[PDB]
Design a protein around this ligand. Structure first.
Ligand SMILES: Nc1nc2c(ncn2[C@@H]2O[C@H](COP(=O)(O)OP(=O)(O)CP(=O)(O)O)[C@@H](O)[C@H]2O)c(=O)[nH]1
Ligand code: MET
Ligand SMILES: [Mg+2]
Lengths: 117, 470, 267
RNA sequence: AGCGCCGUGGCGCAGUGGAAGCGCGCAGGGCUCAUAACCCUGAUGUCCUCGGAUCGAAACCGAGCGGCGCUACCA
């Protein structure tokens, strides 16, 4: 009754490698289709890879060298361990701040897991 | 235009509130279901057992709504050494019209005497059939003293099995055998993961679980599929608890006693010390009705070593500041429910794991500390908790003289040495003090594979006493 | 109206260590004004400049800022300052900077007083500054004793009482210090009535708090109690805190419990 | 929960009581036939928020926020 559909909502990360530069436009779409706020996602991307740039426009402009496969892989890791829980298939969970860190909670279930780093 | 807080108030006072307990009620006529007892304290202790990292705090939270919270930064995520406590109020709908499976409702400890039915279409209210306490037992293969002691507290059992994982979880069987050791039958089997299986897989898992329960002492265990995360099928769990599990024999005849499992210093930091509070022993009472203002003695207490290496035992005399149970301060204490006995003791006794598994007696009784204990043991065929990859689960050997082993005497977690081995009898010498009151059902664990491993049960038959220094 | 150097005479002396501000590197070195001194330009030659031979000298000059200095010879006939940069000890550079911070900070209050009362800075210096640097060796320690002990100006003739009371307000507002002495005391008690003992111990300790220095035994943990005190002269706090220690030992040695000290009184 | 640390220019340190710093980075220029090395010029800041003595604070202090380490679970 509740879940007739029982992720399939990952936007294909179509990137741009302009040699010295790299532009990722899909950053907002992957922010939406994964129900993820933009700033936390982009800081996690910067924490995975020690490269520096800016955010331009609804896109991420990082001046460094990476194939689309490797940034795709980094997004795959973030998808594997943040947007969807390993134990059960779900995605509607989002960031919350339970005594200073980011403590995750869910909506479909009501989880309380301490994932911050 | 009423605020949600105004709505919840209006319902709370409409539900009768939480009436203050009488200061001196006639205790001869009091039953555990009495209105003064049932509304403000928990009379039955239910304990959760399960495999590691499957969810036993979450099931309790889904039942009652009281968080175990989990603490100690590093321990926020892996495992928690201390037990997890929560109070649930069992409410049955007074309307027969509503379906029987969903009439039951487990609420938090702050609910009213008769809250309204959340079922859309029923104006009937909820009657309180019982209040229950929950003792979350850690289920790790290293942490064994706390699980045995929390068992030694509780009176009802709750087994969790995950479906998609392998059927024969070994430490779940270890939990079940530990429960069987202390003389409990009332065990309810839970299927934690049911949404994530198919129809055929769930039935196969049920068949496996049934195939496991044929040789154990427990035979007619109820099995019910629940979900700690999805938070459904809660009412029927309350149904099974109410029907299957009655109140253990507990009246006011037996002399007063306490068994402390947790210690809690009450020192609110940042606050000035001129406004402080005593030290609180988190203890369970199996026998004894305790009233606001009492002198009690922690029998093993101060444990000293003299210049000559002899262990001196100084009981911790103490006057009870308060008996914190459930939500509010209570005038009297009910046997069969964990309570924070706050006393004049210096909180440095209740800061760390210091009062974990220690016997207490009010003034007017003289339990005996011992140093050598005669023990009557009996072992099982194989060790529980080792996933041998297909080869003959390890067989228990016969005990050797002079071997350090963990002997859980009731709640006390002690490491004793065997001084003699007989056909069914042994003698244990203790360096960590232990007292004997009546029988104190005992669990035995050895060190064969690094961490402790349960082997068999035992009961004290005799012992060499020590006289406390006054 | 910036003038009137801190020291005694109207030309710098010989063989001393000072600190200049750099303005220009034109042909032979640095002709630099002095902020350790009044206003007079002094020479350093590029030979008296660089310890290591360098490609671009500017990286060692950094025009516009302040740099270590030494006056060797002084033209006390028409004014020339034979000065160098490399002729300073490796350690004594920090002595030069600390001397300069003292002198500069003394200059700031005198400039404030001069721009308030419209007396030229030289007069306020003359009446006040060098009598202080004579009695106590410096005006900074003179101000430090004046904030605590008012005998400093006894025997010094001021231009006006207004300058006095204004600069007293300024020393009490700007030179305001009291180091936080901290201790940590363990309760090891295993006794029966310990909370009442702790309450009475803090009662006794906080009853020692004087008007100027207040001792507050704050709680952070069951064993660890923190002693915070404002040592106004960095000597009364230790004795106050030892008295507190004795008071907790007194309360604890008779009820039945035991207590121990982890961190004794330290600034 | 309290205490020890902190509040970027892209970074790390810093003087923090005259009001924008140094190196690493980046744009640009210079030397060279040419490249690297070397040499010069730079635009980046609410030096986190709110108030206060102060001509004036980014600095000196405090009625709030955020991020760091311990006291350790502090009913
Ligand atoms: N899919 C699914 N996940 C669950 C369920 N119940 C709990 N979990 C997961 O378990 C996690 C919580 O585990 P936790 O209760 O801490 O395990 P634990 O009780 O400490 C294991 P132990 O008692 O041996 O110490 C949650 O993050 C949640 O996602 C369930 O029914 N289904
Ligand atoms: C901490 S002791 C457990 C029961 C108590 N009423 C709570 O708190
Ligand atoms: Mg638990």
């Amino acid at each position: 009754t509740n879940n007739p559909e029982l992720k399939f909502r990952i936007p294909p990360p179509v990137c741009l490698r302009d040699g010295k530069k790299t532009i990722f436009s899909n950053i907002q779409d992957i922010a939406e289709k994964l129900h993820r706020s933009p700033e936390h996602l982009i800081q996690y991307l910067f924490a995975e890879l020690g490269t520096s740039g800016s955010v331009d426009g609804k896109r991420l402009v990082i001046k460094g060298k990476f194939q689309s496969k490797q940034m795709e892989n980094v997004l795959r890791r973030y998808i594997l361990e943040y947007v969807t829980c390993k134990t059960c298939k779900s995605i509607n969970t989002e960031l919350k701040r339970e005594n200073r860190l980011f403590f995750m909670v869910c909506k479909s279930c009501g989880s309380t897991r301490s994932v911050s780093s | 235009g009423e605020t949600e807080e105004e709505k919840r108030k209006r319902e709370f006072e409409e539900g009768g509130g939480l009436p203050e307990q009488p200061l001196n009620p006639d205790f001869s006529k009091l039953n555990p279901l009495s209105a003064e007892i049932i509304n403000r304290q928990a009379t039955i202790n239910i304990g959760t057992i399960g495999h590691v990292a499957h969810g036993k705090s979450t099931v309790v939270r889904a039942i009652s709504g009281v968080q175990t919270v989990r603490f100690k930064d590093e321990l926020e995520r892996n495992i928690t050494i201390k037990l997890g406590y929560a109070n649930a109020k069992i409410y049955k709908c007074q309307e027969p019209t509503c379906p029987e499976p969903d009439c039951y409702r487990s609420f938090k400890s702050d609910k009213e005497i008769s809250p309204k039915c959340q079922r859309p279409g029923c104006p009937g209210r909820y009657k309180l059939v019982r209040h229950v306490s929950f003792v979350d037992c850690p289920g790790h293969d290293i942490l064994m003293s706390t699980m045995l002691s929390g068992a030694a507290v509780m009176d009802a059992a709750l087994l969790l099995i995950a479906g998609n994982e392998s059927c024969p979880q070994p430490q779940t069987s270890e939990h079940l055998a530990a429960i069987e050791i202390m003389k409990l039958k009332h065990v309810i089997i839970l299927q934690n993961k049911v949404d994530l299986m198919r129809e055929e897989s769930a039935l196969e898992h049920q068949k496996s679980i049934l195939k496991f329960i044929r040789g154990t002492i427990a035979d007619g265990a109820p099995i019910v599929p629940i979900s700690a995360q999805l938070k459904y099928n809660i009412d029927a769990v309350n149904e099974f608890i109410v029907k299957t599990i009655p109140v253990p024999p507990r009246d006011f005849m037996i002399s007063p006693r306490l068994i402390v499992i947790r210690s809690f210093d009450v020192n609110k930091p940042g606050a000035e010390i001129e406004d402080l509070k005593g030290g609180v022993a988190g203890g369970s009472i199996l026998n004894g009705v305790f009233k606001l203002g009492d002198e009690i003695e922690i029998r093993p207490g101060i444990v000293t070593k003299d210049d000559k290496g002899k262990i001196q035992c100084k009981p911790i005399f103490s006057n009870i500041v308060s008996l914190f149970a459930e939500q509010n301060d209570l005038k009297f204490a009910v046997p069969g429910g964990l309570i924070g006995v706050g006393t004049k003791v210096d909180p440095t006794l209740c800061r760390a794991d210091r009062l974990v598994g220690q016997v207490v007696g009010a003034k007017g009784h003289l339990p005996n500390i011992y140093t050598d204990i005669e023990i009557n043991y009996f072992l099982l065929r194989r060790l529980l908790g080792v996933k041998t990859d297909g080869q003959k689960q390890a067989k228990v050997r016969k005990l050797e003289p002079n071997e350090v082993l963990m002997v859980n005497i009731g709640s006390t977690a002690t490491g004793a040495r065997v001084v003699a081995v007989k056909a069914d009898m042994a003698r244990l010498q203790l360096t960590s003090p232990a007292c004997t009151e009546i029988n104190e059902k005992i669990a035995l664990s050895r060190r064969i594979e690094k961490h402790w491993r349960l082997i068999g049960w035992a009961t004290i038959k005799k012992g060499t006493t020590l006289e406390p220094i006054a | 109206t910036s003038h009137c150097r801190f020291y005694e005479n109207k030309y710098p002396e010989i063989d001393d260590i000072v600190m200049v501000n750099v303005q220009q590197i034109a042909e032979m070195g640095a002709y630099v004004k002095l902020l350790e001194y009044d206003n007079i330009e002094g020479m350093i030659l590029l030979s008296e400049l660089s310890r290591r031979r360098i490609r671009s000298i500017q990286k060692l000059i950094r025009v516009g800022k302040n740099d270590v200095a030494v006056v060797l010879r002084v033209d006390k006939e028409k004014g020339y300052i034979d000065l160098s940069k490399r002729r300073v000890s490796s350690e004594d550079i920090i002595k030069c900077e600390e001397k300069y911070q003292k002198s500069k900070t003394v200059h700031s209050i005198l400039r404030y007083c001069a721009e308030k009362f419209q007396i030229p800075l030289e007069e306020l210096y003359k009446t006040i500054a060098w009598p202080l640097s004579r009695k106590f060796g410096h005006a900074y320690e003179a101000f430090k004793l004046s904030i605590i002990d008012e005998t400093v100006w006894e025997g010094i003739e001021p231009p006006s009482k207004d300058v006095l009371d204004e600069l007293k307000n300024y020393i009490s507002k700007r030179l305001t210090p009291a180091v936080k002495i901290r201790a940590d005391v363990e309760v090891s008690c295993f006794s029966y009535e310990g909370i009442d003992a702790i309450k009475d111990a803090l009662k006794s300790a906080e009853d020692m708090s004087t008007e100027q220095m207040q001792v507050k035994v704050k709680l952070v943990a069951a064993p660890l109690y923190v002693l915070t005190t404002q040592a106004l002269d960095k000597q009364k706090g230790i004795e106050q805190l030892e008295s507190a220690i004795e008071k907790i030992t007194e309360v604890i040695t008779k009820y039945g419990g035991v207590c121990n000290i982890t961190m004794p009184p330290k600034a």
